[PDB]
Symmetry: C5
Amino acid sequence: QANLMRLKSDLFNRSPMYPGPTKDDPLTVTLGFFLQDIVKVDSSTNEVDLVYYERQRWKLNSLMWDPNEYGNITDFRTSAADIWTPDITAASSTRPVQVLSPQIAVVTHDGSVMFSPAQRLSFMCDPTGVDSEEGVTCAVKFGSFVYSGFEIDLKTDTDQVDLSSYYASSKYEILSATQTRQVQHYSCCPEPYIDVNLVVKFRER
Amino acid sequence: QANLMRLKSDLFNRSPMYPGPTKDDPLTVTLGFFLQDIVKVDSSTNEVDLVYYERQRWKLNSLMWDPNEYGNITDFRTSAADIWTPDITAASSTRPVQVLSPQIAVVTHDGSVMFSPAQRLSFMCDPTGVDSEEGVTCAVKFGSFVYSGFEIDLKTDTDQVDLSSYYASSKYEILSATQTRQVQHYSCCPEPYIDVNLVVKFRERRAGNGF
Amino acid sequence: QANLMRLKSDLFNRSPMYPGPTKDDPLTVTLGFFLQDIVKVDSSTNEVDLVYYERQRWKLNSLMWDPNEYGNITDFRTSAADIWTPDITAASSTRPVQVLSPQIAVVTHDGSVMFSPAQRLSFMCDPTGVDSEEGVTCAVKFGSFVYSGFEIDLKTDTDQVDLSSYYASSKYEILSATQTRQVQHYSCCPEPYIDVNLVVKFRER
Amino acid sequence: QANLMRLKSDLFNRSPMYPGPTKDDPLTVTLGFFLQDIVKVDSSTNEVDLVYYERQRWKLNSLMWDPNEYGNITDFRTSAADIWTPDITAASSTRPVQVLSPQIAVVTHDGSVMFSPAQRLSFMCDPTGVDSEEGVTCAVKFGSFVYSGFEIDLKTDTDQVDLSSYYASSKYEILSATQTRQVQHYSCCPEPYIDVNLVVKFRER
Amino acid sequence: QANLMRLKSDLFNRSPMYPGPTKDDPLTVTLGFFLQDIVKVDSSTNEVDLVYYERQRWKLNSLMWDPNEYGNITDFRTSAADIWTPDITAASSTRPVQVLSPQIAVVTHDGSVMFSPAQRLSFMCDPTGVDSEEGVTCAVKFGSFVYSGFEIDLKTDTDQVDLSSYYASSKYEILSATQTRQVQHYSCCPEPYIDVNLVVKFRERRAGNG
Ligand SMILES: O=C1C[C@@H]2OCC=C3CN4CC[C@]56c7ccccc7N1[C@H]5[C@H]2[C@H]3C[C@H]46
Ligand SMILES: O=C1C[C@@H]2OCC=C3CN4CC[C@]56c7ccccc7N1[C@H]5[C@H]2[C@H]3C[C@H]46
Ligand SMILES: O=C1C[C@@H]2OCC=C3CN4CC[C@]56c7ccccc7N1[C@H]5[C@H]2[C@H]3C[C@H]46
Ligand SMILES: O=C1C[C@@H]2OCC=C3CN4CC[C@]56c7ccccc7N1[C@H]5[C@H]2[C@H]3C[C@H]46
Ligand SMILES: O=C1C[C@@H]2OCC=C3CN4CC[C@]56c7ccccc7N1[C@H]5[C@H]2[C@H]3C[C@H]46
Ligand SMILES: *[C@@H]1O[C@H](CO)[C@@H](O)[C@H](O)[C@H]1NC(C)=O
Ligand SMILES: *[C@@H]1O[C@H](CO)[C@@H](O)[C@H](O)[C@H]1NC(C)=O
């Protein structure tokens, strides 16, 4: 109790918040999707609803501490509002994302943060052919809203999306689910943007 | 008035908030479900909506006081925002939980906290067979979102879910309702996670069973 | 202006907020319902939607003042967030209550508070028979969420619910509407809880 | 920039917020409705949805300044949260009002405030006959929620509702739209309440 | 880290917030629409739902800094709540705008701000004829809610709306999309108001142009 209280107070109250990465001090965020359910499909609007956990990881020097100075504490939990979090956003949503979990991150003594919120997302997807054997493929890109590749880079720890919690009696079964880093240029903006492309092939069960 | 004001000021203003449990100082939270209503079932999405009270209990040394130092006060009520609460979450929801009550906890002189909010949850459930006599079974796990078994443990005071306030004219009648501690390992994470599994067998309301 | 500003500053800024009632210093809240409209009925879910004003009254010593010390001011209006309010809750709602009005209370020199928000409530009710001549009866209990009878007691000023603002072209007409204090014990909890039971008999017009 | 910053700091930071009108220092609020669209009608619930601007005006001595002391500034814009606003509310709503605009007021050197938010309101209205040539009439009262006629009075600058922005391809055309001050006594309350009654006659196109 | 922290503290904590433009010190905001999807059309209410990015740009002297005084930093990102933003609003919405993105702006050393939120808007539009080959045209004006032309002026960098991110399998295909500055007088108000008029011609997705 006493040690952890002091640690948190030293980090968050006594110094200013991390102001985000820069070209001089860029940052790599690791992303992993754990798909839980394709809830529904709206063929009149081409919107599809997913439930998933999005695991995000990154490391800041300003969150480091020596465990021996603070009661042998190696890690702690804290409200995501107490720390900088990356502005990772789906690029083809049609509604604001619904958060289905507390927003709490895990900070380790080496400055590592793991943050893994559950979300329901409605996104752009034509479900024509979902009732077939072939199924249908849809995709959604996730990346930083304001940070280019020179400030935020993304990687995945694997190309395969974790389907081990996928709801077995979902109305839709997953044929394939991948997550793949991409570099992209858009007419809006001079500098390149990095995303992870979630590609899901699925059909009616 | 005067004594309780001082007690609250001593606890909440004069010291920092409890920063949650750790591997060295873990915590056991007790859970009890009081099921009120199965409001609806959506067979086109396999989502079902429950209304229930979730009673949570735990005990902190940092919330202890001697009643004789504070006007013989044994317990008080306070906004849940004034204290640490455990991050107990349903593991198969499809919408954000709707809170149907004030969020106020009861703190006792021994450091016990009881906190019992009402909620409406939509969760993953195939209702195929609900219109039968047999009914249908669905389940939802409740556990800490970020704390493993080494920091937060769960127990129940009984396997039986309290159905004594269940809405008698619900469209769905409850056949059985249990709540059972489980230990689980997931591919995401090295350390084990504890949940309480709410298992509810229910069917569309009938006038008469079988002969 | 000048007097009222001082009064409010003396009460709310210069002393702590009232921490709620206790067994030693319990409190009585008076409830009165003014039913405006039964908007709809959902027979597929047994939910019914009411619009109503819930008048709440109570009296605190910590809100008293002498009018002669403050420009002859006998009462004032203020945001409900500036004061303690009782945690009166419907016991069989199925959605969070929608507030249809500002949340402003009236405080009188004797420490009386009147607080009278407009609300839309969805609650548990089987409407089977609403299309009949007999109609249908439904009920909903209102009481403190955390305070037992030893801390908060409830009374009504009358058994009859005020229907004088009821929408004349509602789809549902009210046959009867009562509000009745009750004492209750529940298996969860050792001490007794007080509620006011709103009982409404109504039918299609 | 420099002058306006000082003016705002003099008014809002250096003195307390206006605590609302009283019997000794009452206030007149002027109301004007600018009707934009009748979006829809629900005949199964007798609810109708309007989009409109509600222009509110009032004058406080505590917001006066001499332009010559502050760079010749005659008026400025500011967030409505920085000032007291009146609690004018529709008396027969069935959902919370949706705000469709920024909430920003205009303050003039004489202490005048103009505040003119856009809103979507669902309110109690039987649309039976809207498909006829005669059309249908509906009405909704707007008034202070907590201030009686002794504290807040209302007036209009005209009996005619401004239809000059009304959506020309609305599903419903407006036949007539008036706004009329009323004095009212209710069974709840001893003192009189003032409202402006918005009366709209409309039909299908 | 250290330099940027100081820069932000110098600008936002040590001086007061910009109180908005005036007749003496007016401001020009540049607008650019990037249309993503026409999600749906409701012919029973004449409401249509768009998803789009609205790029807003303006320049304040009070946000200038010399890069050489602050570790060679030419620009930074920050929460839109930390700065003044213009009150640009759709003039014929029927619901509150849904924000589909973080609200973060980019500030440059010359005092330039770029702010580009994603939004879903429901607005007044009669879709009669959307199922035809000709399609249907709808329009919505965007302008300052409280600032007249004497305080806020608007311009576009181009008349053409960017459709390069438009969802290719939308239920509705875009035939044309323009954005055009206008000056307007209204019966409410003596002084003129500036808007940019977003005009979109669209139809139900076909599979052939006939
Ligand atoms: O037009 C676009 C689409 C594109 O979407 C992928 C993600 C991106 C990251 N941010 C989010 C806003 C955006 C941008 C800025 C200014 C105008 C339009 C615009 N967007 C996105 C764009 C990239 C780059 C940038
Ligand atoms: O994929 C999962 C499923 C599983 O759900 C039961 C509850 C858990 C408690 N927390 C909440 C998020 C979660 C987690 C972290 C990182 C990636 C995926 C992931 N989840 C849940 C998981 C456990 C562990 C952990
Ligand atoms: O199980 C219940 C039902 C009952 O509902 C009527 C109102 C009450 C006032 N508060 C609200 C929460 C409640 C309570 C506490 C702990 C477990 C279950 C539980 N509830 C309600 C109960 C009473 C008492 C208490
Ligand atoms: O019962 C009512 C209906 C009536 O509605 C018109 C507007 C009014 C202004 N305020 C809003 C709340 C109200 C009031 C106070 C206490 C109990 C009931 C009650 N209301 C409204 C009433 C008036 C007076 C008062
Ligand atoms: O009544 C109106 C309609 C008109 O709508 C187009 C947009 C405008 C920009 N602002 C937003 C509010 C408004 C205004 C001010 C005071 C009373 C009514 C009123 N409005 C809009 C008006 C213009 C001008 C002004
Ligand atoms: C840390 O652990 C050591 C043994 O490794 C133990 O003796 C000590 O109590 C702990 N130190 C602190 C400061 O808690
Ligand atoms: C960065 O560094 C040099 C000096 O080392 C400076 O003169 C230059 O203008 C800076 N910025 C850019 C964009 O090169």
